[PDB]
Amino acid sequence: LSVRTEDFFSKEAISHARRVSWAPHTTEKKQGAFAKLARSNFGDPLPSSFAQEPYFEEEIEAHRKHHRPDVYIYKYNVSPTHFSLRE
Amino acid sequence: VQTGSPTHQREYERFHHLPGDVRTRPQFDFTFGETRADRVMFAWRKRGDLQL
Amino acid sequence: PPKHYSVESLRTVGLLPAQLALSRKPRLRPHVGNLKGLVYPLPYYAMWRGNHNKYTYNKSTVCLWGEGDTRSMYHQHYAHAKCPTDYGRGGREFEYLTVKRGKMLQKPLPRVQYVAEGSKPVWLFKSWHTPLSSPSMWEREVQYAEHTPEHIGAKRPLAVVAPRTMHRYLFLMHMEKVTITVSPLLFGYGHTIQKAVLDFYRRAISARSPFPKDKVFLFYAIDHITPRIEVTWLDGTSYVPPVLEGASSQDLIQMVMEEAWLAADRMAAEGRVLNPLAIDDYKWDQLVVFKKVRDKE
Amino acid sequence: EGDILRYMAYDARNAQFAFAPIREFPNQQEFFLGEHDDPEKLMEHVDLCPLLFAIPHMRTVVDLHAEHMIPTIAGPGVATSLYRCIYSKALLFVQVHLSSEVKLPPQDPEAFKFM
Amino acid sequence: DSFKEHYHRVHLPRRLALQRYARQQSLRNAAKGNVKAEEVPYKYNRWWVNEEHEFVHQYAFVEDPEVTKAKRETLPPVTRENIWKEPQQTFFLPFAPYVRVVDYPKDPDAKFLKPVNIPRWKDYMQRTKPVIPRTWY
Amino acid sequence: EQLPRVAAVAAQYITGQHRPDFTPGMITGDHVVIVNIKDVVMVGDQWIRVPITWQTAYPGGKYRIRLTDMYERDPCMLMWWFLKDEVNRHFVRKLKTRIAP
Amino acid sequence: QRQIAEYTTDPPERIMAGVTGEKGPLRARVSGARLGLQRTPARIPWTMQGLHR
Amino acid sequence: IGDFDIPKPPPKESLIANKQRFDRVLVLDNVDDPGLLGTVLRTAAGFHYDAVIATNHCADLYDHRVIRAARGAHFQKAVPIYTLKEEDGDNVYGMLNHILQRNDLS
Amino acid sequence: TRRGGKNLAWRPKMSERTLEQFVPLHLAFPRRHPNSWQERQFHLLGYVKWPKEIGFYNAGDNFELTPQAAYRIYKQNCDETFWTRLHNEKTIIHLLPLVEQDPGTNMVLVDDIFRHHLKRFGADHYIYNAVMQAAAFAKDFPRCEQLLAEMRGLGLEPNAQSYVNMMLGARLTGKPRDQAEAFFREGIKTGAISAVMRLDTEFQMWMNQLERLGSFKAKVGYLSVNEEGASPMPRDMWALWGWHRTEAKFISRKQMISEQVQNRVRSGKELVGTVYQKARRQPWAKYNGMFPYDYNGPARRPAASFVDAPTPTHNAEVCGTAY
Amino acid sequence: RSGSGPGDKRIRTDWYRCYPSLMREKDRDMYHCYYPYLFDHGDKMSLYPKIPENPREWQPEQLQTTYDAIREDKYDAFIRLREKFPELYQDTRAWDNPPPFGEFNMFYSV
Amino acid sequence: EEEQVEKARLDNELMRWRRLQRAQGSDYDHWMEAETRRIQEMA
Structure with a gap:
């Protein structure tokens, strides 16, 4: 092949869930916005590792997770988005 | 007294007929990994200024 | 003729590439005398195993939660974060390379549900030029008409992801009024509810606003009415944060601020022009406090 | 055919700068097209011009949030693109200057970030 | 014979017998008049981010017995002229060759005017592998 | 079930000691198909703390591994090792009495 | 009927009746009627196992 | 002769957003003489x-x-x-x- | 430089600090608890093996109580001090499948529970929604409408559960999509149902959930699946509900009592959720070591002795399925 | 021959440069995946975990999700971007439609 | 969010550090001093 500009600069290894969007205007780093705002280059390495045992909980939609109604059927909670055991 | 393989009988269990700390399991175990230069297999808890 | 970069051009520039075949230095081939049988061109696929390709017929291995035969046992995280068929070898036996026989079956990709056929959705362009604190970054990206709540009066669907912030103060810009009703007499036993509501009123008076006195109001209920809070937003909608036993002023502030974010999102979807958050004297005082904390530790 | 044309117009980005025909013709003149928060919009306007070929000689995507294109006082430099005119075969050398800032960075970044 | 030698001497015939018993279930289908090759599921989850936020890729390759038989029986096509005439390159070009000299600015010493297309030295040193989503050189 | 217990119970039937006509010179034992080796148990942290040791004919060729390592390589080697111990507990003198069971 | 309701109910019961949290219905509402502790799911995290005086 | 540590400069947040009103503010514009500058600072x-x-x-x-x-x-x-x-x-x-x-x- | 021991399959050429991260301290497989310890842990936590007619651990190792046993427990503890509206609601909940399978005689029991509830506590959202769902499963849509009208007349404003019971009764009796959407729109207008979506889309979501559920006499839904584990003791006592061994599914009665006390004294903490708390819950730094009982087995406690029980008269006849 | 001598320490082998990026099997959950994590679900892929057909098998704190707007929107935007900008999302085309067997593979074919 | 994650990690590290100091100070003379001070405090 030949020398290509695509291979010059490395991209971020951010995950799909931790991503904001797959748009080409959001492919870059998240701190670059504040770096451009401050007019300074930030070279902070190793920001953080995940964990020794990184566990997470299921997140619900911004409105559902707080306005879930207490609707039940025979022994299970019922929501337009989730099922769960009720006692 | 040695009566079995290291799987069944541990190395510090040979001195079980003696009273004292040899009847307890040590705090440190150096058998796994890089062999000690002086071949120290076990080390019991420090009793004051003495460690077995 | 068209010109391109080459090793001779880079040499004339002043950079020499590393030697590949003829070199007295190690060639980094740990498999030349260690891996036996067939070796694949993928480099270093068997180094974590111990630089060997023996004992591959084993099925079960020593494994933590999420690895190996954990699939048969229940764990709250992995039960929703891993498929019970994607469990492989654990420990140093991680599969950097896998070879199998048979006809490969590629299941069809999932389909987006609750989308009517023939609907042309609106596309939202998300960029870092928009500040992250704006609700537009949290709004949906592919938004359909079948997802827009028209009964509320919205022109667009509501945001699906909420910011993850521990709110320590109140922001009364998107709130028309806050009425806090408490009992005049003090309960005999230690009333944590009463204490939390009093602290909430204190922090609402000290909240982030040019003049929070114009929006915060305190009332006394001689009728032994339980202490309550009522936040009326700009559209007139009212929210009542339930003050239960054990809840603190920080918890009440978190609830009020999350509901304020949701209400502002509803306003923006309905078409209401909301005043944005910016720098103010409250933020300068918080900067003073922040510098104090930084100088302390 | 359309796929190959699109991929050539895309690899116009991967085209190198040293082998670009910037000084192909004798005469040259400079013009100022204004200042843009997001010059990528103006670049897209230039790309979608009926009087220019859709396959340029060189293309540089200006992403201000990339670690190598953050505008500083001693900024990274100039993002350069080169377009060809269809009927006169002239050249348009578009230069986005990311080093024109005359504002010093904050002395303490933590306070500016908190603010 | 030692412990492991005796174990393997006893069990390798037993392992082969177990493999034969496994292939018996596959031969069950061919006796029904309906031959279907082994159906392995494709892995959509072979791109990961490790603890240190480094990109990891799992290479999973599936061998097709029909393609194997086709290659055993049929003749391979003619080699490409460029493939057999152009020699194999002896050196590996860097993904980001540092140039250090560009004739763009009028004053060559001015650093704030260097074009951003040219890779920096940190890129030239650290780009020893294709970009995160890319897997082939 | 625990690995030493399973090994003992299996060796009792393998060596033929479970038969009232058992004769030490006569090798007559029943066959035992042991399944679910991957689900054998070991009380406590003994999976990490119990070693398997063996030396070769070389100086410094001494291997000290763990039950975890033996299980990672081949879980059936653990059962084979414990069965070997249970058999050599009584039939260690000759080779036929060692190997045939 | 209304008087018997208001006479048998309690202030904390009438307070926590119409309340619903992030995890759905409150644990008090869900397991307030316990036909033996063998049926109760015991969904309290280790961070919340402790309880003050 | 003493080697003192320079006192921490006053935060300009007070100048930006002060909770109390300023009655008199002083601005010294190009005071070259160090002795005159010190005397003016002492007087202020x-x-x-x-x-x-x-x-x-x-x-x-x-x-x-x-x-x-x-x-x-x-x-x-x-x-x-x-x-x-x-x-x-x-x-x-x-x-x-x-x-x-x-x-x-x- | 050693002279032997170069089999990399057993003694790899890796550093000790490099193998430290692979040493499995927090091991999960293969096992550390034999089968002989399961009964010990059961009797130590203090649970009893009840006959299958009373209750049993189902396929999910959850202790499911028989509807007959629940009705008998109700009939015995009707007038006790601890009995409550929630107890009546749960009794109706347990009677639901028998009501669905044979609404001829079980609606009588539901009506008896309703009578007792109106005698002791009175009219309430809980009891009214329970009876509405019972009638919906019993295929009495006119009775469901009557109960909704009775709620409206007594002043109990119909709730989201009430409108969902309306929709379920309509779907089970065969009322049109328009009939179900009428109740949905009425709930939306009242405010009992808060929906963030288009109204037709949200109604379709509710209908999809109800179709996934089905009924007890259906053939497709979840409730149609009747396959019980039917074990007197759970097959794994150290099973987890959360992330760490301290978040175990089966714990002691003292811990159960502490948790039931927290459910009332710290109900305000269940309303707020914080990433700080969710990250603090991660057990990566929590102590995971071996206790003396991890080696010796669970502490030996006596089991519940029932030598005073009557002699079984029908010991040959097998107990049928709960429903 | 087979060596079996004392060896020569002049040739400085460097295996520390011969280890790929370490990855643990436990870290293969949906929060570490680079692409939308898909569940097998039998014959069709899905974005949610499989719901047990027997409701008795449901765990007390397990949440049976049937529609998650976050995952739905992210997967939809991802698929639509990959469809509308092929040249811009070309490197993401190895996720689906993999290279078929029989052709030369850089890391497999010997 | 990152501040909350950092604070939670710091709290877990502090918990583990306390658990390890309880065993680091488990020396014989240190345990004797601790129990002596506890007896003097309770009496």
């Missing part, structure tokens, strides 16, 4: 001004002659003294106009 500290500011290339506040003329006017805590240097990033007249529009000064 004595009269207890709200804030003294030095702009347009005034002599260094920590010059030896300035210290000798001030005689402890730098270690006090009552009257804060600021240095608005355009070469560091501070807009002197922007800050002054902010102070004017904030405290309603003449």
Whole structure:
């Protein structure tokens, strides 16, 4: 092949869930916005590792997770988005 | 007294007929990994200024 | 003729590439005398195993939660974060390379549900030029008409992801009024509810606003009415944060601020022009406090 | 055919700068097209011009949030693109200057970030 | 014979017998008049981010017995002229060759005017592998 | 079930000691198909703390591994090792009495 | 009927009746009627196992 | 002869957003003589001004002659003294106009 | 430089600090608890093996109580001090499948529970929604409408559960999509149902959930699946509900009592959720070591002795399925 | 031959440069995946975990999700971007439609 | 969010550090001193 500009600069290894969007205007780093705002280059390495045992909980939609109604059927909670055991 | 393989009988269990700390399991175990230069297999808890 | 970069051009520039075949230095081939049988061109696929390709017929291995035969046992995280068929070898036996026989079956990709056929959705362009604190970054990206709540009066669907912030103060810009009703007499036993509501009123008076006195109001209920809070937003909608036993002023502030974010999102979807958050004297005082904390530790 | 044309117009980005025909013709003149928060919009306007070929000689995507294109006082430099005119075969050398800032960075970044 | 030698001497015939018993279930289908090759599921989850936020890729390759038989029986096509005439390159070009000299600015010493297309030295040193989503050189 | 217990119970039937006509010179034992080796148990942290040791004919060729390592390589080697111990507990003198069971 | 309701109910019961949290219905509402502790799911995290005086 | 540690400069957040109104603000514009600068700083500290500011290339506040003329006017805590240097990033007249529009000064 | 021991399959050429991260301290497989310890842990936590007619651990190792046993427990503890509206609601909930399978005689029991509830506590959202769902499963849509009208007349404003019971009764009796959407729109207008979506889309979501559920006499839904584990003791006592061994599914009665006390004294903490709390819950730094009982087995406690029980008269006849 | 001698320490082998990026099997959950994590679900892929057909098998704190707007929107935007900008999302085309067997593979074919 | 994650990690590290100091100070003379001070405090 030949020398290509695509291979010059490395991209971020951010995950799909931790991503904001797959748009080409959001492919870059998240701190670059504040770096451009401050007019300074930030070279902070190793920001953080995940964990020794990184566990997470299921997140619900911004409105559902707080306005879930207490609707039940025979022994299970019922929501337009989730099922769960009720006692 | 040695009566079995290291799987069944541990190395510090040979001195079980003696009273004292040899009847307890040590705090440190150096058998796994890089062999000690002086071949120290076990080390019991420090009793004051003495460690077995 | 068209010109391109080459090793001779880079040499004339002043950079020499590393030697590949003829070199007295190690060639980094740990498999030349260690891996036996067939070796694949993928480099270093068997180094974590111990630089060997023996004992591959084993099925079960020593494994933590999420690895190996954990699939048969229940764990709250992995039960929703891993498929019970994607469990492989654990420990140093991680599969950097896998070879199998048979006809490969590629299941069809999932389909987006609750989308009517023939609907042309609106596309939202998300960029870092928009500040992250704006609700537009949290709004949906592919938004359909079948997802827009028209009964509320919205022109667009509501945001699906909420910011993850521990709110320590109140922001009364998107709130028309806050009425806090408490009992005049003090309960005999230690009333944590009463204490939390009093602290909430204190922090609402000290909240982030040019003049929070114009929006915060305190009332006394001689009728032994339980202490309550009522936040009326700009559209007139009212929210009542339930003050239960054990809840603190920080918890009440978190609830009020999350509901304020949701209400502002509803306003923006309905078409209401909301005043944005910016720098103010409250933020300068918080900067003073922040510098104090930084100088302390 | 359309796929190959699109991929050539895309690899116009991967085209190198040293082998670009910037000084192909004798005469040259400079013009100022204004200042843009997001010059990528103006670049897209230039790309979608009926009087220019859709396959340029060189293309540089200006992403201000990339670690190598953050505008500083001693900024990274100039993002350069080169377009060809269809009927006169002239050249348009578009230069986005990311080093024109005359504002010093904050002395303490933590306070500016908190603010 | 030692412990492991005796174990393997006893069990390798037993392992082969177990493999034969496994292939018996596959031969069950061919006796029904309906031959279907082994159906392995494709892995959509072979791109990961490790603890240190480094990109990891799992290479999973599936061998097709029909393609194997086709290659055993049929003749391979003619080699490409460029493939057999152009020699194999002896050196590996860097993904980001540092140039250090560009004739763009009028004053060559001015650093704030260097074009951003040219890779920096940190890129030239650290780009020893294709970009995160890319897997082939 | 625990690995030493399973090994003992299996060796009792393998060596033929479970038969009232058992004769030490006569090798007559029943066959035992042991399944679910991957689900054998070991009380406590003994999976990490119990070693398997063996030396070769070389100086410094001494291997000290763990039950975890033996299980990672081949879980059936653990059962084979414990069965070997249970058999050599009584039939260690000759080779036929060692190997045939 | 209304008087018997208001006479048998309690202030904390009438307070926590119409309340619903992030995890759905409150644990008090869900397991307030316990036909033996063998049926109760015991969904309290280790961070919340402790309880003050 | 004593080697003292320079006192921490006053935060300009007080000049930006002060909870109390400023009665008298002082701005020294290009005071070259270090002795005269120190004497003026001493006089302002004595009269207890709200804030003294030095702009347009005034002599260094920590010059030896300035210290000798001030005689402890730098270690006090009552009257804060600021240095608005355009070469560091501070807009002197922007800050002054902010102070004017904030405290309603003449 | 050693002279032997170069089999990399057993003694790899890796550093000790490099193998430290692979040493499995927090091991999960293969096992550390034999089968002989399961009964010990059961009797130590203090649970009893009840006959299958009373209750049993189902396929999910959850202790499911028989509807007959629940009705008998109700009939015995009707007038006790601890009995409550929630107890009546749960009794109706347990009677639901028998009501669905044979609404001829079980609606009588539901009506008896309703009578007792109106005698002791009175009219309430809980009891009214329970009876509405019972009638919906019993295929009495006119009775469901009557109960909704009775709620409206008594002043109990119909709730989201009430409108969902309306929709379920309509779907089970065969009322049109328009009939179900009428109740949905009425709930939306009242405010009992808060929906963030288009109304038709949200109604379709509710209908999809109800179709996934089905009924007890259906053939497709979840409730149609009747396959019980039917074990007197759970097959794994150290099973987890959360992330760490301290978040175990089966714990002691003292811990159960502490948790039931927290459910009332710290109900305000269940309303707020924080990333700080969710990250603090991660057990990566929590102590995971071996206790003396991890080696010796669970502490030996006596089991519940029932030598005073009557002699079984029908010991040959097998107990049928709960429903 | 087979060596079996004392060896020569002049040749400085460097295996520390011969280790790929370490990855643990436990870290293969949906929060570490680079692409939308898909569940097998039998014959069709899905974005949610499989719901047990027997409701008795449901765990007390397990949440049976049937529609998650976050995952739905992210997967939809991802698929639509990959469809509308092929040249811009070309490197993401190895996720689906993999290279078929029989052709030369850089890391497999010997 | 990152501040909350950092604070939670710091709290877990502090918990583990306390648990390890309880065993680091488990020396014989240190345990004797601790129990002596506890007896003097309770009496």
